Amino acid sequence: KTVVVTTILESPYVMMKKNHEMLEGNERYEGYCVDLAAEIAKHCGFKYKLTIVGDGKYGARDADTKIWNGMVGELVYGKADIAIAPLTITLVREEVIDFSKPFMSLGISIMIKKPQKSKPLTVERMVSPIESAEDLSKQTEIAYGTLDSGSTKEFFRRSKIAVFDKMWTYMRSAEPSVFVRTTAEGVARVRKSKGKYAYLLESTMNEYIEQRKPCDTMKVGGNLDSKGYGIATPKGSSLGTPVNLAVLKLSEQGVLDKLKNKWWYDKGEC
Amino acid sequence: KTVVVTTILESPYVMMKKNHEMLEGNERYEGYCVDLAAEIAKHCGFKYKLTIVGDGKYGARDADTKIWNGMVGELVYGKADIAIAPLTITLVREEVIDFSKPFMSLGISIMIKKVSPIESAEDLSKQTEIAYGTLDSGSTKEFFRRSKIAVFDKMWTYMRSAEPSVFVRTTAEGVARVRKSKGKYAYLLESTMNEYIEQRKPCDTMKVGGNLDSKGYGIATPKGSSLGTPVNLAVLKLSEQGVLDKLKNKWWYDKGECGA
Amino acid sequence: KTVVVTTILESPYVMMKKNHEMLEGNERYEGYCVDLAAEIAKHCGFKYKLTIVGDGKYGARDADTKIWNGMVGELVYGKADIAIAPLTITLVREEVIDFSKPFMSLGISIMIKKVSPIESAEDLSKQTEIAYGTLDSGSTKEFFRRSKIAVFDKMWTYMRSAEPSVFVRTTAEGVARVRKSKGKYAYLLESTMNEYIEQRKPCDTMKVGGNLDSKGYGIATPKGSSLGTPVNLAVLKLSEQGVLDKLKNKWWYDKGECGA
Amino acid sequence: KTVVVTTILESPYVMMKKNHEMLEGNERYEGYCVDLAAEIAKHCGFKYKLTIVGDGKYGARDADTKIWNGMVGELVYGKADIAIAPLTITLVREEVIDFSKPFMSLGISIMIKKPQKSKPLTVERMVSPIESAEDLSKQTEIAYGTLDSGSTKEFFRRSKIAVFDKMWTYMRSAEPSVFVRTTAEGVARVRKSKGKYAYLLESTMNEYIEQRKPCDTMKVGGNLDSKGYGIATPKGSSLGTPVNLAVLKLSEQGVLDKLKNKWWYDKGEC
Ligand SMILES: NS(=O)(=O)c1cc2c(cc1Cl)N[C@H]([C@H]1C[C@H]3C=C[C@@H]1C3)NS2(=O)=O
Ligand SMILES: NS(=O)(=O)c1cc2c(cc1Cl)N[C@H]([C@H]1C[C@H]3C=C[C@@H]1C3)NS2(=O)=O
Ligand SMILES: NS(=O)(=O)c1cc2c(cc1Cl)N[C@H]([C@H]1C[C@H]3C=C[C@@H]1C3)NS2(=O)=O
Ligand SMILES: NS(=O)(=O)c1cc2c(cc1Cl)N[C@H]([C@H]1C[C@H]3C=C[C@@H]1C3)NS2(=O)=O
Ligand SMILES: N[C@@H](CCC(=O)O)C(=O)O
Ligand SMILES: N[C@@H](CCC(=O)O)C(=O)O
Ligand SMILES: N[C@@H](CCC(=O)O)C(=O)O
Ligand SMILES: N[C@@H](CCC(=O)O)C(=O)O
């Protein structure tokens, strides 16, 4: 029985191939997550069919309805069997699905438009108006936001740290809305906001987008927290233990190392 | 019903209290893992008593006898119910005990004494002038033993075919041997231990290059035990509340007995 | 019995002199390969007639029809008895024709228009700004097609999925494309042709990096032919006597119409 | 039927392992040739055992008696089945044995003791008294020899180049004899001759010995010849064609190059 693998359209995890008009099957998509799924199927022998969520969301809880949505939502109700995608392991998600061991470390970072090189002997130096989350919260000239129905927004909502609570209170009462519906949308907002928008996205995607052309964006400060991506699986499913074992084996053999190297650094430029 | 907690005497995870002679119970222990165990007990709601494993071993398999030693052996054979300790998550361990989510990330790092002629691990592998080794019955010797990348196999072969013995009984012994080798012996250990040692007096050691791989420490539980899910949820809650970062800052950066 | 000698019009291997309209027979051809064929005939003691393959193809298999083209096809199907030409020795060719000892070492090289921004092949593969291709129906394209190294697979995949066609019909066409691309196109070709081109006017092309691999040119004969051993012995004798070195110096460095 | 492999004791081709006192079989040797033979057996399946020639010579035809010796000699008379060794493909050797395609390229080079760095602003300049073969043959202060019963001595024996003829005429009338019995003997002679002895050997061994400590020897000039190493096989044997095919598919792609780089660079003591 072929099981359905749900995934999100997010570079470089899964990107549509250029010649995807005539290709049919699992060959339409390329990236980190397709190779991860191939290695998972090479460890334990099973047939998989890639799919993309229609709503295009990672997964969250809707207000006052207590209904899961996104990848997590459709994995809970049983229309998907395994989620090999950059899904952030969180306490709220672990209560409804099973998570494997993290296959990629990450953290919340800050994305701002790259300032022009300054000159005052005749050396160029890099000066930025934002250097950490504290100064970003204190200032008001630069707006900042997160991705709707994601993990960073959830983290800021329930955060008890004073600075993160201040940032979330600003975000909730921000007119117009600073939350975007896609990572690419937020990155484009940063690009054409003339440095007046700051995108709080994941460290991996931030580094990948920084490493690619036209590389007009930069990452300031450090990671706000430490988290990881885990291959999700419905509670009480036969695939949980084999998937965890496969992830552990792939981490020990360093396959994840080479996949990250060839999907984040090899194809980067500038 | 008190819960037996096995752990190893490793700094800054578990230390001995300065006045532990006049102290009994769990109050004679301190460190990152003691605070972690206290937080886990508070969240889950159980009474626990901290115990040190009889042999200072993290856990491995002996010479073709299929017997687990150290904390892993303590958990497998029912001598303990949980292990809050710097236990690395590995394939050979997960098959015999249940691991929680990694509460602290780490990697493998090279420690040398204070031009940096060693740089990355490739130069250390190509050059046989400076000796290097690992901790026996740990998660690094077995990592090099089971590796397949040519550089790691080369280093493991040099380790096994080394005269005299290069593996150290304790990580403190390795630190001391690095210190009194006048920059001739290098030590391979976890990045967190390397940072803690290089940040402590006399600060004569340092970490060179980057992490050879990426792993993490997880709370270990006997296979098929009722505590696995509660401690996993507790670890996730602690990470989401940012108290794991608070504990790491307290035991790694709050004191900082060095100039940096 | 005149022996038919197939060869390709490649410089400085075979050239049509300067006034070949007034010349007939073998006297209208000149180059390294013409001199090599003359020496081979002198050593073995046979009369030969130099002929140019009808299609400017070195040799390959067509689209799943199991038909050899070019000089290799000219030799397999009995149209010729020997091929004194810059024919690279490859696994697929040796199974159908008999190769002699390599009379001239070679390698795959990268040439760009006149500190190179790419230099090594890894940087060229990583950067998609500059296009790169090979000679069609040759040996470099089949080397990239049959390669298993990750970088070479990436380059081959970029070559096949390139709009418009990045391959060239002739090495001269590739050189012209490199000259007219204003540094936007890099040609992948043999090291010997690269050096010859860069040692000729107007000297606007230069070779970057090292050599991707090491190969050689051999004298090819039909499988199970009586001429294989004599030509192998003649090639060995010429190599030992320095005849090949003298010919290479004459046709690569003696003229040298370049500033270096 | 298990065939025997004849090989010379040369580095980094065949070196006795450190723990070779108790090891038995093919595990007593390490180097280039042991992996070459292993890959040969893997590509075309056969059983092989490693043997070393008793006389310790590469092979040459002695005059008068007209009896071959060395690896070539013992391959001719049928006491060995294959010579997976750094055997130079020679015209006289191809008249009695079968040679495969060259797996390694090489040339005849000059080895001299490294002089001390010049003092004179405060830059160190590398100046040597010999930079080619013409100036080596034009002087008499520095002696130069070759390896007895090898390919370089045979090349100098029947060379019609004026410079090489002068070198051979000097060598044939050198008292005491400038010919050495092994590569190690010639290297030691160069090292402890205080720069008065020059060694002519293959470029591969010269580069390898230059790359390792104490690296007190240097290679001057370019390669005199262009020659290769071929896996020898008795004339008319049924293993010649499979051996040649195995050599070809081994040289195809990065396998032979990988082995050469791993054996010539990991000894990077200098
Ligand atoms: N370098 S990376 O971010 O792509 C990355 C990150 C991680 C990897 C592997 C890689 Cl390649 N494996 C570890 C896993 C291995 C075992 C120890 C921790 C988990 C279970 N998680 S991780 O520390 O989140
Ligand atoms: N900064 S740190 O090393 O003390 C650290 C490291 C890590 C933390 C939390 C902290 Cl504070 N949580 C993550 C866990 C949280 C959820 C996502 C990945 C695992 C499950 N593991 S981690 O990436 O190994
Ligand atoms: N200098 S060169 O490229 O013209 C060149 C290159 C080579 C020459 C001779 C010359 Cl002059 N001979 C060797 C041959 C001689 C014997 C040893 C290897 C083959 C058989 N092949 S080679 O290494 O491909
Ligand atoms: N780089 S090297 O000297 O180790 C080296 C040298 C040579 C290799 C392969 C390597 Cl790795 N293969 C070629 C062979 C391949 C085919 C073309 C020429 C012969 C038949 N001979 S070579 O040009 O003598
Ligand atoms: N990976 C996140 C979404 C990305 C983000 O919010 O930055 C999640 O699983 O919810
Ligand atoms: N902490 C590791 C051992 C430390 C080391 O090997 O450096 C373990 O749990 O096995
Ligand atoms: N000389 C090659 C073709 C030229 C090339 O590929 O560069 C051959 O004989 O196949
Ligand atoms: N490889 C040479 C020996 C080395 C030398 O004489 O330079 C041979 O087979 O004869």
Our answer on whether A and C touch (3+ beta-carbon pairs < 8 Å) is: yes
Chain D interface, best mutation among B119, B125, B128, by max D CB count within 10 A: B128
Our answer on whether D and A touch (3+ beta-carbon pairs < 8 Å) is: no
Nearest chain C residue (CA) to D223: C245
Checking DSSP bridges between strand A108-113 and strand A217-220, what pairing results, if any?
Answer: antiparallel
Same domain? For A60 and A79 the reply is yes
Distance of CA A224 to the CA centre of its chain: 15
Same domain? For B29 and B154 the reply is no
B123: number of Cβ within 10 Å = 15
**Cβ within 8 Å, pair C127-A262:** no
Q: Please name the helix (run of DSSP H) or strand (run of DSSP E) that holds residue B126, with its range, or none.
A: helix B121-126
CA dihedral of B56, B77, B31, B55, whole degrees rounded to 10 = -10
B167 vs D107: CA distance, rounded Å: 45
Q: Residues 6 or more apart from C170 whose CB is under 8 A from it?
A: C56, C135
Q: Which residue is listed with tokens 């036209």?
A: A214
What are residue A196's phi and psi, to 5 degrees?
A: -95, 0
Q: Which residues does residue D198 pair with via DSSP β-bridges, in sequence order?
A: D144
Give Cα separations from D255 to B178, D40, D228 (angstroms): 38, 12, 17
Q: Which residues does residue A180 pair with via DSSP β-bridges, in sequence order?
A: A147
Partner residue opposite C233 with nearest CB, options D91, D105, D257: D91
Instruction: Residue C161: list chain A partners with CB under 8 A.
Output: 18-19
Q: Which residue is listed with tokens 């089971």?
A: B146
Give the start-end residues of each E strand in C73-127: 82-83, 97-99, 104-106, 108-113
Same domain? For D13 and D44 the reply is yes
A265 vs A254: CA distance, rounded Å: 16
Checking DSSP bridges between strand C131-133 and strand C185-190, what pairing results, if any?
Answer: parallel
**Cβ within 8 Å, pair C90-D257:** no
Q: Which residue among B171, B188, B208 closes a domain?
A: B208
8 A C-beta contact, residue B196 and residue B211: no
Same domain? For C16 and C78 the reply is yes
Residue ranges lining ligand 8, Cβ < 6 Å: D 58, 86-88, 147, 150-152, 201-202
Does any domain span residue C60?
A: yes
Same domain? For C233 and C112 the reply is no
Does ligand 7 come within 6 angstroms of the Cβ of C140?
yes
Residue D39 annotated as binding site: no
Our answer on whether B and C touch (3+ beta-carbon pairs < 8 Å) is: no
Does any domain span residue D83?
A: yes
Partner residue opposite A266 with nearest CB, options C126, C129, C161: C126
Same domain? For D133 and D183 the reply is yes
Q: How many CA atoms lie within 13 A of B4 on its CB side?
A: 12
Instruction: Please return the burial class of C229, using the count of CB atoms within 10 Å of its CB with bins 0-12, 13-18 and 19+.
Output: middle
Provide the annotated binding site of C for L-glutamate: 86, 88, 93, 139-140, 190
Distance from CA of D29 to the nearest CA of B (A): 16
**Cβ within 8 Å, pair D251-C214:** yes
Does ligand 7 come within 6 angstroms of the Cβ of C137?
no
Q: How many domains does chain C have?
A: 2
B119 vs B130: CA distance, rounded Å: 13
Instruction: Please return the burial class of A45, using the count of CB atoms within 10 Å of its CB with bins 0-12, 13-18 and 19+.
Output: exposed
Q: Which amino acid, residue D110?
A: I
Distance of CA C229 to the CA centre of its chain: 23
Q: Please name the helix (run of DSSP H) or strand (run of DSSP E) that holds residue B104, with its range, or none.
A: strand B104-106
Same domain? For A129 and A212 the reply is yes
B85 vs B100: CA distance, rounded Å: 12
Does ligand 6 come within 6 angstroms of the Cβ of B109?
no
Residue with the nearest Cα to atom 6 of ligand 2? B104
Same domain? For D147 and D199 the reply is yes
Instruction: Residue D89: list chain C partners with CB under 8 A.
Output: 101, 236
C157: number of Cβ within 10 Å = 11
Does any domain span residue D57?
A: yes
Chain A interface, best mutation among B91, B92, B232, B253, by max A CB count within 10 A: B91
B242 vs A226: CA distance, rounded Å: 9
Partner residue opposite A252 with nearest CB, options B91, B241, B245: B91
Chain C interface, best mutation among D96, D225, D251, D264, by max C CB count within 10 A: D251
**Break positions in chain C: residue before each gap, C to N over 2.5 angstroms:** 114
Q: Which amino acid, residue D29?
A: Y
Give the start-end residues of each E strand in D53-146: 97-99, 104-106, 108-113, 143-145
* CATH number for B121: 3.40.190.10
Give Cα separations from A1 to A6, A27, A47, B183, D263 (angstroms): 16, 20, 7, 60, 49
Does any domain span residue B54?
A: yes
Does any domain span residue B25?
A: yes
Q: Which of D155, D202, D208, D231 to mutate to test the pocket of ligand 8 (most atoms within 8 A of CB)?
A: D202
**Which tokens belong to D249?**
């598919």
Chain A interface, best mutation among B89, B101, B142, by max A CB count within 10 A: B101
Q: Which atom of ligand 1 is nearest to the CA of A257?
A: 11
B13 vs B16: CA distance, rounded Å: 10
- Grouping H, G, I as helix, E, B as strand and the rest as coil, residue C189 is strand
Neighbours of chain C (3+ CB pairs under 8 A): A, D
**Cβ within 8 Å, pair C126-A19:** no
Nearest chain D residue (CA) to B160: D19
**Which tokens belong to C100?**
């002699």
Distance from CA of B126 to the nearest CA of D (A): 5
A177 vs D207: CA distance, rounded Å: 67
Q: Count the residues in chain A.
A: 270
Partner residue opposite B240 with nearest CB, options A90, A244, A251: A90
D200 vs D112: CA distance, rounded Å: 9
Checking DSSP bridges between strand B205-208 and strand B220-222, what pairing results, if any?
Answer: unpaired
Q: Which residues does residue C110 pair with via DSSP β-bridges, in sequence order?
A: C188, C208
What is the A223 CA–ligand 5 centroid distance (Å)? 14
Same domain? For D123 and D85 the reply is no
Does any domain span residue A270?
A: no
**Which tokens belong to B154?**
């080369």
Q: Please name the helix (run of DSSP H) or strand (run of DSSP E) that holds residue C233, with its range, or none.
A: helix C228-241
Give Cα separations from A198 to A68, A106, B5 (angstroms): 28, 18, 46
- Grouping H, G, I as helix, E, B as strand and the rest as coil, residue C49 is strand
List Cβ<8 Å contacts ≥24 apart for D235-238: D235/D96, D235/D97, D235/D98, D236/D98, D237/D81, D237/D98
C157 vs D24: CA distance, rounded Å: 47
Q: Which of A32, A207, A251 to mutate to test the pocket of ligand 1 (most atoms within 8 A of CB)?
A: A251
Instruction: Please return the burial class of C131, using the count of CB atoms within 10 Å of its CB with bins 0-12, 13-18 and 19+.
Output: middle
Q: Which residue among D186, D201, D220 closes a domain?
A: D220
Does any domain span residue D255?
A: yes
Give the start-end residues of each E strand in chain C: 3-7, 48-52, 82-83, 97-99, 104-106, 108-113, 131-133, 185-190, 205-208, 215-217, 220-222
**Cβ within 8 Å, pair C127-A269:** yes
Same domain? For C97 and C114 the reply is no
Q: By C-alpha distance, which of D91, D110, D109 is closest to D230?
A: D91
**Which domain does B237 fall in, by range?**
3-105+216-254
Q: Which of C244, C249, C252, C253 to mutate to test the pocket of ligand 3 (most atoms within 8 A of CB)?
A: C244
Q: Please name the helix (run of DSSP H) or strand (run of DSSP E) that holds residue B111, with its range, or none.
A: strand B108-113
Same domain? For A251 and A193 the reply is no
What are residue B185's phi and psi, to 5 degrees?
A: -115, 130
Alpha helices (H) in D29-161, listed in sequence order: 32-43, 70-76, 91-94, 134-138, 151-157
Does any domain span residue D150?
A: yes
Same domain? For B67 and B135 the reply is no
